[PDB]
Design a protein around this motif. Structure first.
Motif, PDB file in Angstrom:
ATOM      1  N   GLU A  62       0.855  -1.185   0.000  1.00 23.32           N
ATOM      2  CA  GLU A  62       0.000   0.000   0.000  1.00 23.32           C
ATOM      3  C   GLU A  62       0.889   1.233   0.000  1.00 23.32           C
ATOM      4  O   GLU A  62       1.711   1.420   0.912  1.00 23.32           O
TER       5      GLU A  62
ATOM      6  N   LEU B 290      -7.160  20.955   4.036  1.00 26.45           N
ATOM      7  CA  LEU B 290      -5.720  21.129   4.205  1.00 26.45           C
ATOM      8  C   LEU B 290      -5.030  19.786   4.401  1.00 26.45           C
ATOM      9  O   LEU B 290      -5.539  18.902   5.097  1.00 26.45           O
TER      10      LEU B 290
ATOM     11  N   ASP C 158      -2.764   4.836  -3.564  1.00 29.89           N
ATOM     12  CA  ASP C 158      -3.653   5.988  -3.444  1.00 29.89           C
ATOM     13  C   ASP C 158      -2.997   7.194  -4.105  1.00 29.89           C
ATOM     14  O   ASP C 158      -1.917   7.612  -3.695  1.00 29.89           O
TER      15      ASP C 158
ATOM     16  N   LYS D 268     -11.073  16.521  -0.418  1.00 30.40           N
ATOM     17  CA  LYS D 268     -11.935  15.890   0.571  1.00 30.40           C
ATOM     18  C   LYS D 268     -12.908  16.955   1.058  1.00 30.40           C
ATOM     19  O   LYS D 268     -12.480  18.024   1.510  1.00 30.40           O
TER      20      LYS D 268
HETATM   21  C1  LIG Z   1      -6.028   9.292   0.767  1.00 34.25           C
HETATM   22  C2  LIG Z   1      -6.038   9.096   2.277  1.00 34.25           C
HETATM   23  C3  LIG Z   1      -6.757  10.186   3.025  1.00 34.25           C
HETATM   24  C4  LIG Z   1      -7.894   9.961   3.744  1.00 34.25           C
HETATM   25  N1  LIG Z   1      -8.297  11.131   4.355  1.00 34.25           N
HETATM   26  C5  LIG Z   1      -7.400  12.122   4.039  1.00 34.25           C
HETATM   27  C6  LIG Z   1      -7.343  13.460   4.414  1.00 34.25           C
HETATM   28 CL1  LIG Z   1      -8.566  14.078   5.461  1.00 34.25          CL
HETATM   29  C7  LIG Z   1      -6.285  14.245   3.963  1.00 34.25           C
HETATM   30 CL2  LIG Z   1      -6.169  15.917   4.450  1.00 34.25          CL
HETATM   31  C8  LIG Z   1      -5.322  13.700   3.127  1.00 34.25           C
HETATM   32  C9  LIG Z   1      -5.367  12.375   2.745  1.00 34.25           C
HETATM   33  C10 LIG Z   1      -6.406  11.563   3.206  1.00 34.25           C
HETATM   34  C11 LIG Z   1      -8.589   8.654   3.875  1.00 34.25           C
HETATM   35  C12 LIG Z   1      -8.076   7.731   2.767  1.00 34.25           C
HETATM   36  N2  LIG Z   1      -6.621   7.798   2.634  1.00 34.25           N
HETATM   37  C13 LIG Z   1      -5.782   6.739   2.678  1.00 34.25           C
HETATM   38  O1  LIG Z   1      -4.619   6.821   2.280  1.00 34.25           O
HETATM   39  C14 LIG Z   1      -6.175   5.374   3.204  1.00 34.25           C
HETATM   40  N3  LIG Z   1      -5.433   4.346   2.786  1.00 34.25           N
HETATM   41  C15 LIG Z   1      -5.724   3.134   3.252  1.00 34.25           C
HETATM   42  C16 LIG Z   1      -6.760   2.922   4.137  1.00 34.25           C
HETATM   43  O2  LIG Z   1      -7.071   1.679   4.623  1.00 34.25           O
HETATM   44  C17 LIG Z   1      -6.086   0.633   4.613  1.00 34.25           C
HETATM   45  C18 LIG Z   1      -6.684  -0.561   5.287  1.00 34.25           C
HETATM   46  O3  LIG Z   1      -7.918  -0.914   4.689  1.00 34.25           O
HETATM   47  C19 LIG Z   1      -7.459   4.042   4.534  1.00 34.25           C
HETATM   48  N4  LIG Z   1      -7.167   5.266   4.088  1.00 34.25           N
END
Ligand SMILES: C[C@H]1c2c([nH]c3c(Cl)c(Cl)ccc23)CCN1C(=O)c1ncc(OCCO)cn1
Ligand SMILES: Nc1ncnc2c1ncn2[C@@H]1O[C@H](COP(=O)(O)OP(=O)(O)NP(=O)(O)O)[C@@H](O)[C@H]1O
Ligand SMILES: [Mn+2]
Ligand SMILES: [Mn+2]
Ligand SMILES: [Zn+2]
Length: 353
Positions: A63, A208, A150, A193
């Motif tokens: 990941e 941010l 991602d 977001k």
């Molecule tokens: C893109 C990032 C991301 C999220 N919120 C954000 C905010 Cl608020 C800001 Cl400012 C910036 C980046 C992000 C949620 C989703 N993201 C993740 O990388 C992610 N990867 C894996 C996951 O699960 C693994 C196990 O299943 C869960 N999440």
């Protein structure tokens, strides 16, 4: 020790790293090149973020997180409804305007559409796009059915950080006031977001992101500049973060048929970890010989955050990650109960048999 044995099993294989790094760079570099062909994304650049690039990815290098950043000159921000973290962006970009508003939803939609069409042309590698995950600013790819990536569109601002950050990044006693000032001279990012708007969302808003600063801290994490560069300065900070992430991941896996743990993320443990570093700023408070005590203190700090329902964003102190607007009381109480059981029984969730 048991914790050292867990850490051993969490190490990434060098062979896996080599193979995964090559796969990801090939796909990402291709998508970058293709996106730059679009008039709207000409100036896009790459910023690697998240646990792989912070050297705290555990178990497998499966990941990866990357930002595709775009510098927009003459950017003007307007905070959305005193939310502290969400903003309107005011301003080949006309396609994304809603009035004077640069719509996060419109830009993300085209970004996602371009990537989806481009991965369909990649024929030397199995690359697919995962279904949209509500609340994520990223477009997520799966390479060879094994590696998730991602890709987050980000606008880059070289202006001073927003006022909501004035009291954040409280690193002065740990990494120095000079470092805090230097970090706050770096750019900041806005990602698509969207803020909650009742039961809907304000599709025009951006959020941010300081993910690049988090990486710089984790990769330059000691009070001593030579922390972890010699055998006399091997601290246990990153080991504690790895163990906290594994604790949460294993509990979420066990209780997946449950709903109460769905909202907890590794970012909650990352944020709590940064606060623990602020409260324990000396490298001698993270001696490798004290791994068990250091980890226990990380666990109890996280328990206190759950019980008080307080976990301030490290950059934006008035944004409470554990607000009842984001996570129900019952969910925090449920996780508290499971972590207390682990602590009281020396972490059986870590055992394989
Ligand atoms: C893109 C990032 C991301 C999220 N919120 C954000 C905010 Cl608020 C800001 Cl400012 C910036 C980046 C992000 C949620 C989703 N993201 C993740 O990388 C992610 N990867 C894996 C996951 O699960 C693994 C196990 O299943 C869960 N999440
Ligand atoms: N809620 C959030 N608020 C702000 N930034 C976030 C949030 N969630 C994720 N991020 C950022 O996005 C990066 C990648 O998120 P994610 O892939 O979920 O976690 P990670 O830190 O890479 N740990 P891992 O579980 O090993 O992938 C994080 O390291 C943060 O910098
Ligand atoms: Mn990640
Ligand atoms: Mn991710
Ligand atoms: Zn160190």
């Amino acid at each position: 020790s048991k914790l050292r044995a867990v850490l051993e099993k969490l190490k990434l294989s060098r062979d896996d790293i080599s193979t995964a790094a090559g796969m990801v760079k090939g796909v990402v570099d291709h998508l970058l090149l293709r996106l730059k062909c679009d008039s709207a994304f000409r100036g896009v650049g790459l910023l690697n973020t998240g646990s792989y690039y912070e050297h705290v990815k555990i178990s497998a290098p499966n990941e990866f997180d990357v930002m595709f950043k775009l510098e927009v000159p003459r950017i003007q921000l307007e905070e959305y409804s005193n939310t502290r973290a969400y903003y309107f962006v005011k301003f080949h970009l006309s396609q994304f305007l809603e009035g004077e508003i640069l719509s996060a939803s419109k830009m993300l939609s085209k970004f996602r559409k371009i990537i989806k069409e481009e991965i369909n042309d990649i024929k030397d590698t199995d690359v697919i796009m995962k279904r949209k995950r509500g609340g994520s600013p990223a477009v997520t790819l799966l390479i060879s059915e094994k590696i998730s990536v991602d890709i987050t569109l980000a606008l880059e601002s070289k202006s001073s950080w927003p006022a909501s950050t004035q009291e954040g990044l409280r690193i002065q006693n740990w990494l120095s006031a000079k470092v805090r000032k230097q970090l706050r001279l770096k750019p900041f990012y806005l990602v698509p977001k969207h803020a909650k708007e009742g039961n809907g969302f304000q599709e025009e808003t951006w959020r941010l992101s300081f993910s690049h600063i988090e990486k710089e801290i984790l990769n330059n994490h000691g009070k001593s500049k030579t922390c972890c560069e010699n055998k006399e300065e091997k601290c246990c900070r990153k080991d504690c973060l790895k163990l906290m992430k594994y604790l949460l991941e294993q509990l979420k896996e066990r209780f997946k048929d449950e709903e109460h743990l769905d909202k907890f993320s590794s970012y909650h443990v990352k944020t709590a970890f940064f606060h623990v570093c602020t409260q324990n700023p000396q490298d001698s408070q993270w001696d490798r010989k004290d791994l068990g005590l250091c980890f226990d203190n990380c666990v109890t700090y996280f328990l206190q955050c759950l019980r008080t329902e307080k976990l301030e964003n490290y950059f934006i102190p008035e944004f409470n990650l554990f607000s009842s607007n984001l996570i129900d009381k019952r969910s925090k109480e449920f996780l508290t109960k499971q972590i207390e059981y682990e602590r009281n029984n020396e972490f059986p969730v870590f055992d394989e048999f």
